[PDB]
């Protein structure tokens, strides 16, 4: 039986952050990837 092979989801990770001396909170962007695949 023929099966298709596809590399599983991968991407870059970017950190969105204001200045350190405004706040320490950051957000994370996973490029070209579902939110479901993140964990």
């Amino acid at each position: 039986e023929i099966l298709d092979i596809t590399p599983c989801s991968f991407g870059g990770v970017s950190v969105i952050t204001p200045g350190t001396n405004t706040s320490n909170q950051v957000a994370v962007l996973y490029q070209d990837v579902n939110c479901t695949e993140v964990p």
């Binding site: 590399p7 991407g11 870059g12 490029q31 070209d32």
Partner: peptide, 22 residues
């Protein structure tokens, strides 16, 4: 008229076509 993996990644443009049209 204009119509046309292994680490390759295509980043989306900051301005979409709709915003450029606007």
């Amino acid at each position: 008229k204009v119509t046309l993996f292994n680490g390759l990644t295509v980043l989306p443009p900051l301005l979409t076509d709709e915003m450029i049209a606007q």
